[PDB]
Amino acid sequence: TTSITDLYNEVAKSDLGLANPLVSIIMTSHNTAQFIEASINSLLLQTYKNIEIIIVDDDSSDNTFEIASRIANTTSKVRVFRLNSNLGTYFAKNTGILKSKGDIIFFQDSDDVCHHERIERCVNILLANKETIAVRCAYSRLAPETQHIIKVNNMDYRLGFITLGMHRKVFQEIGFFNCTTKGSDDEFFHRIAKYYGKEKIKNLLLPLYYNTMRENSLFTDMVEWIDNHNIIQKMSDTRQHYATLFQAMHNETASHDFKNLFQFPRIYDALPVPQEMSKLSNPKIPVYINICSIPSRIAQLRRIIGILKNQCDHFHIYLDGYVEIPDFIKNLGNKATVVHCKDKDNSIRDNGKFILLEELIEKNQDGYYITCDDDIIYPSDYINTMIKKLNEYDDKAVIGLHGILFPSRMTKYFSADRLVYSFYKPLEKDKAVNVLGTGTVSFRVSLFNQFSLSDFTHSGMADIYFSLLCKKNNILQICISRPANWLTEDNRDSETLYHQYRDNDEQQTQLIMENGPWGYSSIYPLVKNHPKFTDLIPCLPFYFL
Amino acid sequence: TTSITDLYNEVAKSDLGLANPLVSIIMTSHNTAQFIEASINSLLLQTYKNIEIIIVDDDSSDNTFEIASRIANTTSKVRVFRLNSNLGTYFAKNTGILKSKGDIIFFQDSDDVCHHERIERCVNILLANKETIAVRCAYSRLAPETQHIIKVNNMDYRLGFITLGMHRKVFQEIGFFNCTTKGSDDEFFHRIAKYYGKEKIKNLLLPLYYNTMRENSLFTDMVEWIDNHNIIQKMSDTRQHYATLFQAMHNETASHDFKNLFQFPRIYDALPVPQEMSKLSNPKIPVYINICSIPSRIAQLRRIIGILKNQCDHFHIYLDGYVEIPDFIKNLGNKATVVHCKDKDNSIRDNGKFILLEELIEKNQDGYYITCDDDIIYPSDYINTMIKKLNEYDDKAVIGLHGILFPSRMTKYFSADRLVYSFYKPLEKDKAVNVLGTGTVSFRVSLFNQFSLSDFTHSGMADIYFSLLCKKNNILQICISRPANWLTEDNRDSETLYHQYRDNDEQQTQLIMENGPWGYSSIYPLVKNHPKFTDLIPCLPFYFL
Amino acid sequence: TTSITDLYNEVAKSDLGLANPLVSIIMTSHNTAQFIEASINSLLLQTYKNIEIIIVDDDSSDNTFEIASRIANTTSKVRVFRLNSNLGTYFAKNTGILKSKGDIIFFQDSDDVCHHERIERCVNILLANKETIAVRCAYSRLAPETQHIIKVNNMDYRLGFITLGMHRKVFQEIGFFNCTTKGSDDEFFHRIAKYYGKEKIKNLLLPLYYNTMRENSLFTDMVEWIDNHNIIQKMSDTRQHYATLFQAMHNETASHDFKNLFQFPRIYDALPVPQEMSKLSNPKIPVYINICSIPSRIAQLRRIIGILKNQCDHFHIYLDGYVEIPDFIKNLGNKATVVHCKDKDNSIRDNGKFILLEELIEKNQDGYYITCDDDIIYPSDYINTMIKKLNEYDDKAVIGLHGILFPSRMTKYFSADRLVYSFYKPLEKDKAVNVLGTGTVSFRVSLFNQFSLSDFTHSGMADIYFSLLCKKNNILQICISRPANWLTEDNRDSETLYHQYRDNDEQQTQLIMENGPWGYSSIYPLVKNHPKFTDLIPCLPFYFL
Ligand SMILES: O=c1ccn([C@@H]2O[C@H](COP(=O)(O)OP(=O)(O)O)[C@@H](O)[C@H]2O)c(=O)[nH]1
Ligand SMILES: O=c1ccn([C@@H]2O[C@H](COP(=O)(O)OP(=O)(O)O)[C@@H](O)[C@H]2O)c(=O)[nH]1
Ligand SMILES: O=c1ccn([C@@H]2O[C@H](COP(=O)(O)OP(=O)(O)O)[C@@H](O)[C@H]2O)c(=O)[nH]1
Ligand SMILES: O=c1ccn([C@@H]2O[C@H](COP(=O)(O)OP(=O)(O)O)[C@@H](O)[C@H]2O)c(=O)[nH]1
Ligand SMILES: O=c1ccn([C@@H]2O[C@H](COP(=O)(O)OP(=O)(O)O)[C@@H](O)[C@H]2O)c(=O)[nH]1
Ligand SMILES: O=c1ccn([C@@H]2O[C@H](COP(=O)(O)OP(=O)(O)O)[C@@H](O)[C@H]2O)c(=O)[nH]1
Ligand SMILES: [Mn+2]
Ligand SMILES: [Mn+2]
Ligand SMILES: [Mn+2]
Ligand SMILES: [Mn+2]
Ligand SMILES: [Mn+2]
Ligand SMILES: [Mn+2]
């Protein structure tokens, strides 16, 4: 019986793979707290010093993210991000690609560990020939208990797709990985072969990767057990249907169109796959994203477009004070509708984020209304996470990230008697709040039957007026959970309305005092009247009235 | 807000429903230990004294069956049976119908309770008119915590199908319930309406039944929550597909053919339903049932036919000593192949149960070979349970119910050094045994490549020779778990081979001693070489060598 | 490293131990479901055929008792009893001694297994010399995972006390094991050595017993770990205090007094041990046992004395119809007070069981009033279990075993509308009932402030009147859980009041109808007003009013 010691001896015996561009290794973690620390330790022991480790957590329920954050704090080579919703391993891979900075991209699962010479040999093979575009090395299956080799199809090690590494420019020419639960690695490899060519891919018959064999994994549907050291891997019915789906799609679609087909981030499936094969939100109604922008943050706005030009079906951009329409907005074409009020006296500032909503009231077009601010950096999984949370709450309540909770006895809105859960600050559990910041508000349009923008008497107070509108229709506001620094604020030394109205909040205080009650008195009746809000019931609501 | 006290007041206010044939109330229990005792107490409090309560347990993982057995021991009106595999509520209902003795059949779920005057009123309405064939009464949804009414479609109580009660002769004219996970009650009600007529069904607008609203139930797919007292019930996509499936089937099939279409017990779906809608085994290969019979137990054989004439695709009956072919065997037609050796000297007795197996070796026809004895009463879920257990073990081992475990140092086969787990005795957990009784052996035919009946030198020792054949091919024998008295032995004062060879087991002892090793020494290598057998590893195998 | 295979080889190599009196092996089980089946299998494989296996379950919370009952049903050599309260291993050993029938007694823990030749060799050594009174054999510690030997004090096997076996007459001359949690085996062995002599004990230096080393066991307080194969066993502070306690007690007490010091069953500690070393009830108030007896069951009464003459501080026996005081009652002396009303017309029958209670009302003597009937066989742990249950409920409610639950709409007491949980029938969970049978009622005297026997107008209806008294003072009646056949009824073809008043219950029906309400209407207010009764809240009490 061949063991992993034999694999290491064979790797050391072979001389294959023997400037230094930055290499980004992207790890995907999901409830793998037992193995992620070992995986990161194995990645940090690589002989290729000029590396960085981008780790993406697919909304783990265990302390995987805590271990990843601790290791990222120990050393500067590890940068860790967490997805607030479970979207599969390939969405995390694409997010890591977006967050990466190196010219070469490699992959490694969190539950698996790699040889301490994998990246060096793979980079040497990749850069040996200029025309080479990608390199892959053989992997193997191991039992974590006995450390023996789980032979697959009567072979110790076989060429795989998780070990495939390529240049950074590959993902900007043929798109990114297809956002599916499983089987997207084969599709991406075949896409590379169709676009560049089979001669552009290098193969390294060395067991440089070690897939840990654990139960209830993604590929267990392909496993037929013969004994403790031999398994048979055959594609399932859904996997075969997916495989036949894209092979015909590769032939029926031009290669240069691939960049226009698999754009990331995305919220719709690029291929007709069943629900059990895709973990994307896949909304059944059009998605509208509304955002207001001032010129002083125009560059930030561009970045938002670079993260939201594909995560919606329609845009509503309110340019407040702009002189001319920016190029990145007019490039969207009919997808974006722009409000270009050039007068500050007649301007409505943040209230423009609700303009399209009024039109939907006159059209009864169901959708997922999203409101965003131009000073917030949004992640690649923001829209999918918001839609998933809305579906989890059955679209019966408005959700947000910037939560504000104040009692009904408060005499000053910006006093110390309010509690603020910022969008860039972590939240362990979902909490119902009185006021949600409109920069992170997502809600289904069908929740509101009648709405008019003229009810928003004062500009710059969108949060208070939106909370009043939600309270009038008895619609709950939920501050959903999120990891630390999920939405990193980017002020960039600009002017903010918080600094302007922090010491001059007379109108906000008047509205809060005149439109009570607040606190849990406005939450407990709404949270006690629905089973889906049972986990959101306040613990001791007798003081926070 | 209407409460259950208002429902009881309305029931007491209405005078509707005011000889005594035996009435059988059939309860289906599955992980409802918190409510089954209350349900049985409610059924025992009915004013209709001449009742019996047939309870069927759908392989509960909690102590539901223990409570049911205790209550059945307390009083003679309760008879409890347990299905060894989970086959849905309607399979349990049909099993209760088969086990019932009353002329009128009523139903009540284990998680629900009924008014103490439901059965009396329903029977009075049913027997008020001679032409009446079935009666149903309105039900309601209740929250177990607050005891309030969960209104469905803005109505306090609505007519249902679980409360439908009919005569015993109904199930023998249009078949039984369709063996599906859910939605079969509507299909059965529409079948009754199509066959007899809408005028033959009586409706009682009284809340005589109380469906407890608990999470993760079967009908939660139809529930859309509005508040804590109002829900909307709409059929899902799969439910709608099933509903459209049988409505056309009712029109496209003659009424008198229904008896030939929904025969129970069955192992194949009568309608093209998806896997998520049917909990039957649904084998992809033909099922062969093999049985030997002597004339002295001929009546018992008939009963076996009455429970197995539809649970297979082919029969192999070995008539040992019979004078003429019985009517109930020749009525099967080409479905049954009969071996009618009339000479006792040339007879092979139980070895005939393997004759068809040899033919399959010459034909390579994959299937589920089942061996049965004529002195054992089999339940309605026997074949489905065996196939489900085989699929759980991935068809990699032979399963049985009569287990025999003896050490390798044994000097007499029928001595006190062997441990016997009889088929009529309960077993808490699956255990791998050395010898499985051939009267309860089920195995996939593909596990054996070469087999000849001539290897069975001596007759009446089928268990030992079959165990030797399994050990030669390294095929594990597993004594699966079963409840108490799952297979009630029916000797009926006949002659048994155990009494004949108990004091004259020279050949069996010779074979056991000559074909070692036995005990865990013949089990531990087989149980340590497969993950699916991990739960079957012996605890302390150092003494049982 | 020595292994268990070496131990078996050494046992087979040694010839030591090579009529057949009945030998009873007593097993104690407590949450050892993983090993009890293996232990019983090892005991059934012993070469000494003439054996019986008495198993006592120390109120296991897992399915240990289910496995034991199944194995006891498989073969006639296994008899299983369950203690309803946890009283330690030595109380179970003494109960097994009382229930045993053999002339020789051996012991074996449920978590441990023995060699298949231990009992034969031990019996041969014991009966080799007539003057021999007990034999012990060396034991060893084993790891259940690796099956290696856990050396204790740098020795593979050492002489122990669990393996000690002796004659049946030993326990009737020097009493039984001291009812402590641990360390009582050493005390019993030293007691035997002090009484008979060191020459009367035989030692067998053979590893015939295998103590499984599992965490959180009783002797883990003595274990200091050095490595995976070596431990150090040293007595703890409490163990040393207990050891010094009885060694002086052996010298300061006459040998013939031992029989009068360690009588079993008992409810008080024979030695001043701390609470953490004794699992007995140890009441702080005198215990009074009250029982009525008719001559037709006089022999049964004697048996009750044989099980209750030491489980109390005072007796109150009401002889109804007796001619002369029986010898076994007058032998108790001042411990028993007898009421000898010779007139049937002036007799009160079962009401005499409360006579002493009235006296306590005139004396304010706190205690644990116990009422018993002469037709019920009581176990050796009955009083301890009742006192433990009362302490668990903080002495705030009356407990019993014969529970009766009927609705408030019942028009006949002995009709089919009542539910009876008999004392000889199992109950999975404690249930509050309307009426508790006075033959199994245990309650603290301080719960009642004023009581007069004249309130019991009619004789033979003690249950109804006692339930009325409990309801008047708002004292809950709880039918505690018990295993199957915990109290085996012994009618012995006598006359019972149930048969007399089954068809003539006019007075009982009148009292029940005149002293309502009943059912959960009389239980829910009492069960909702105390946290200790939270687990006793009815599930769906809206029908059982
Ligand atoms: O829904 C999921 C399942 C898995 N993973 C991660 O994706 C990687 C690959 O999944 P898995 O280990 O199941 O792959 P396999 O070992 O089955 O090939 C692992 O790091 C998982 O933590 C994920 O992000 N989302
Ligand atoms: O005159 C203005 C100032 C701001 N904004 C927009 O209003 C939103 C909220 O402003 P800000 O970030 O200052 O609010 P804060 O986060 O300070 O509460 C942002 O999208 C700004 O682009 C606007 O439309 N007009
Ligand atoms: O797989 C299952 C699910 C449920 N049941 C039983 O069938 C009855 C009806 O199911 P359920 O209570 O879910 O029905 P609902 O209340 O959802 O209408 C209950 O007694 C369940 O214990 C069953 O036998 N098998
Ligand atoms: O001469 C005989 C006696 C019995 N049998 C069949 O062999 C099986 C096993 O026989 P039996 O029930 O006596 O076996 P036991 O249960 O006593 O071991 C049954 O199906 C019998 O019908 C048979 O074919 N020929
Ligand atoms: O409170 C208890 C603890 C243990 N035991 C049983 O008494 C025996 C001896 O206890 P243990 O196994 O802990 O002894 P050790 O192995 O520690 O010497 C076992 O069969 C236990 O199940 C018992 O009856 N009551
Ligand atoms: O004339 C009588 C009949 C009975 N008993 C006692 O009353 C108790 C209950 O009687 P029984 O067992 O007949 O009651 P059942 O169990 O039938 O309800 C027993 O201790 C009997 O000894 C009595 O004192 N006098
Ligand atoms: Mn993996
Ligand atoms: Mn801002
Ligand atoms: Mn239900
Ligand atoms: Mn038989
Ligand atoms: Mn032990
Ligand atoms: Mn009695």
Contacts of B530 in chain A (CB under 8 A): 225, 227-228
Distance of alpha carbon B88 from alpha carbon B92, whole angstroms:
7
- Residues B530, A225: C-beta atoms closer than 8 Å: yes
The reply to whether omega before C426 is within 30° of 0 (cis) is no
Distance of alpha carbon A51 from alpha carbon B379, whole angstroms:
66
Q: Which residue of C has its CA nearest to B421?
A: C74
Which of C325, C347, C113 lies closest to C212, judged by CA? C113
For B38, the token pair is 């209350």
Q: Does chain C touch chain A (at least 3 C-beta pairs within 8 Å)? A: no
Check CB contact of A227 with chain B, cutoff 8 Å.
Answer: yes
The helix (H) or strand (E) run that includes residue A119 is helix A118-128
For A148, the token pair is 């023996």
- Residues C70, B427: C-beta atoms closer than 8 Å: yes
Q: Nearest by CB to C540, which of B113, B422, B542?
A: B113
Check CB contact of A537 with chain B, cutoff 8 Å.
Answer: no
Nearby residues of B373 by Cβ (< 8 Å), 6 or more positions away: B291, B292, B350, B438, B439
Structural contact between residues A279 and A266, judged by C-beta atoms closer than 8 angstroms: no
Check CB contact of C421 with chain B, cutoff 8 Å.
Answer: yes
Return the ligand number nearest the Cα of A496: 2
Return the ligand number nearest the Cα of A68: 1
- Establish whether residue B88 lines the binding site of ligand 3, counting it when its CB lies within 6 angstroms of any ligand atom: yes
Q: Nearest by CB to C63, which of B45, B428, B540?
A: B428
Nearby residues of C437 by Cβ (< 8 Å), 6 or more positions away: C400, C401, C402, C403, C404, C423, C463
Ligand 5 atom at minimum distance from C220 CA: 17
**Cα-to-centroid distance, B109 and ligand 9 (Å):** 6
For A221, the token pair is 């549907």
Q: Which residue of A has its CA nearest to B526?
A: A227
Residues with CB under 6 A from ligand 4: B 292-294, 320, 349-350, 373-375, 496-498
E strands, C47-117, where?
51-58, 78-83, 104-109, 113-114
Structural contact between residues B426 and C70, judged by C-beta atoms closer than 8 angstroms: yes
For C524, the token pair is 């829910």
Structure determination method: cryo-EM
Return the ligand number nearest the Cα of A372: 2
Ligand 3 atom at minimum distance from B31 CA: 22
Contacts of B66 in chain C (CB under 8 A): 428
Ligand 5 atom at minimum distance from C89 CA: 24
Residues with CB under 6 A from ligand 6: C 292-294, 320, 349-350, 373-375, 496-498
- Residues B542, C4: C-beta atoms closer than 8 Å: yes
- Establish whether residue A438 lines the binding site of ligand 1, counting it when its CB lies within 6 angstroms of any ligand atom: no
Check CB contact of A255 with chain B, cutoff 8 Å.
Answer: no
- The CA-atom distances, in angstroms, between B135 and each of B103, B160, C125, C544 are 14, 11, 77, 26
Task: Please tell me what DSSP assigns to residue C377.
Answer: P
Task: Please tell me what DSSP assigns to residue C447.
Answer: G
- Residues B228, A528: C-beta atoms closer than 8 Å: yes
The closest residue, in CA terms, to atom 7 on ligand 1 is: A89
For A106, the token pair is 């490699």
Distance of alpha carbon B269 from alpha carbon B178, whole angstroms:
8
The helix (H) or strand (E) run that includes residue A307 is helix A298-308
**Cα of A473 vs its chain's centroid, Å:** 31
**Burial call B459-473: b when 16+ CB within 10 Å, e when fewer:** ebbbbbbbbbbbbee
∠ CA(B421), CA(B424), CA(B425), 5° rounding? 50
Residues with CB under 6 A from ligand 2: A 292-294, 320, 349-350, 373-375, 496-498
Ligand 5 atom at minimum distance from C29 CA: 22
For A252, the token pair is 């029926």
- Establish whether residue A89 lines the binding site of ligand 1, counting it when its CB lies within 6 angstroms of any ligand atom: yes
Axis-axis angle for helices A36-44, A64-74 (nearest 10): 20
Return the ligand number nearest the Cα of C217: 5
Which of B413, B416, B447, B419 lies closest to B432, judged by CA? B419
- Residues B539, C35: C-beta atoms closer than 8 Å: yes
Dihedral angle of Cα A270, A273, A275, A281, to the nearest 10 degrees: 0
Q: Nearest by CB to A532, which of B225, B394, B532?
A: B225
Structural contact between residues C538 and C527, judged by C-beta atoms closer than 8 angstroms: yes
Is A503 annotated as belonging to a binding site?
A: no
The reply to whether omega before B517 is within 30° of 0 (cis) is yes
Dihedral angle of Cα A89, A95, A96, A98, to the nearest 10 degrees: 150
- Contacts of B335-338 spanning 24+ positions with Cβ under 8 A: B335/B309
Distance of alpha carbon B387 from alpha carbon B378, whole angstroms:
15
The number of residues making up chain C comes to 545
Q: Which residue of A has its CA nearest to B396?
A: A226
Distance of alpha carbon C82 from alpha carbon C426, whole angstroms:
11
∠ CA(C469), CA(C472), CA(C475), 5° rounding? 80
**Phi, psi torsion values for A141, nearest 5 degrees:** -105, 135
For A462, the token pair is 């969108």
Task: Please tell me what DSSP assigns to residue B155.
Answer: B
Which of A141, A112, A125 lies closest to A7, judged by CA? A141
**Cα of B448 vs its chain's centroid, Å:** 28
**Burial call B492-526: b when 16+ CB within 10 Å, e when fewer:** eeeeeeeeebeeebeebbebbeeeeebbbebbbeb
Ligand 3 atom at minimum distance from B27 CA: 20
Axis-axis angle for helices C506-514, C462-472 (nearest 10): 10
Check CB contact of C43 with chain B, cutoff 8 Å.
Answer: no
Distance of alpha carbon A262 from alpha carbon A283, whole angstroms:
17
Structural contact between residues A305 and A333, judged by C-beta atoms closer than 8 angstroms: no
Sign of the alpha-carbon dihedral angle for B277, B281, B286, B288: negative
Check CB contact of C4 with chain B, cutoff 8 Å.
Answer: yes
- Residues C74, B419: C-beta atoms closer than 8 Å: yes
Return the ligand number nearest the Cα of C182: 5
E strands, C217-313, where?
223-225, 230-233, 287-293
**Cα-to-centroid distance, A22 and ligand 1 (Å):** 25
Burial (0-12, 13-18, 19+ Cβ within 10 Å), A485: middle
Which of C394, C402, C397, C366 lies closest to C479, judged by CA? C402
Q: Which residues pair with A105 in a beta bridge?
A: A24, A166
- Establish whether residue B374 lines the binding site of ligand 3, counting it when its CB lies within 6 angstroms of any ligand atom: no
Distance of alpha carbon B70 from alpha carbon C424, whole angstroms:
12
Check CB contact of B227 with chain A, cutoff 8 Å.
Answer: yes
Give the CA diameter of chain B.
81
Structural contact between residues C439 and C373, judged by C-beta atoms closer than 8 angstroms: yes
The closest residue, in CA terms, to atom 3 on ligand 4 is: B349
Is C482 annotated as belonging to a binding site?
A: no
Establish how many alpha carbons lie within 13 A of residue B385's alpha carbon, considering only the half-sphere containing its beta carbon. Answer: 27
- The CA-atom distances, in angstroms, between B370 and each of A252, B290, B328, B382, B442 are 51, 6, 20, 10, 5
Axis-axis angle for helices C184-195, C237-252 (nearest 10): 20
Distance of alpha carbon B190 from alpha carbon C9, whole angstroms:
73
Contacts of B531 in chain A (CB under 8 A): 215, 225, 228
Is A140 annotated as belonging to a binding site?
A: no
Q: Which residue of B has its CA nearest to C47?
A: B417
Task: Please tell me what DSSP assigns to residue B131.
Answer: T
**Sheet of strand A442-444, all strands in order from the earlier edge strand to the far edge:** A336-339, A314-319, A287-293, A368-373, A442-444, A397-400, A476-479, A431-432
- Contacts of C199-202 spanning 24+ positions with Cβ under 8 A: C199/C131, C200/C131, C200/C132, C200/C133, C200/C134, C201/C132, C201/C133, C201/C134, C201/C135, C201/C136, C202/C125, C202/C126, C202/C128, C202/C129, C202/C132, C202/C134, C202/C135, C202/C136
E strands, A431-540, where?
431-432, 435-436, 442-444, 476-479
Distance of alpha carbon A110 from alpha carbon A26, whole angstroms:
9
The resolution, in Å, is 3.3
Q: Does chain C touch chain B (at least 3 C-beta pairs within 8 Å)? A: yes
| Helix ranges, A362-478 (H) | 382-392, 462-472
**Cα-to-centroid distance, A528 and ligand 3 (Å):** 27
Residue position matching structure tokens 């079962």:
C350
The helix (H) or strand (E) run that includes residue B82 is strand B78-83
Distance of alpha carbon B318 from alpha carbon B415, whole angstroms:
31
Contacts of A394 in chain B (CB under 8 A): 224-225
Distance of alpha carbon A479 from alpha carbon A476, whole angstroms:
10
- Establish whether residue B110 lines the binding site of ligand 3, counting it when its CB lies within 6 angstroms of any ligand atom: yes
Q: Nearest by CB to B225, which of A224, A528, A530?
A: A530
Contacts of B52 in chain C (CB under 8 A): none
Sign of the alpha-carbon dihedral angle for A534, A535, A539, A543: negative
Q: Which amino acid is at A212?
A: T
Q: Which of C85, C111, C162 to mutate to test the pocket of ligand 5 (most atoms within 8 A of CB)?
A: C111
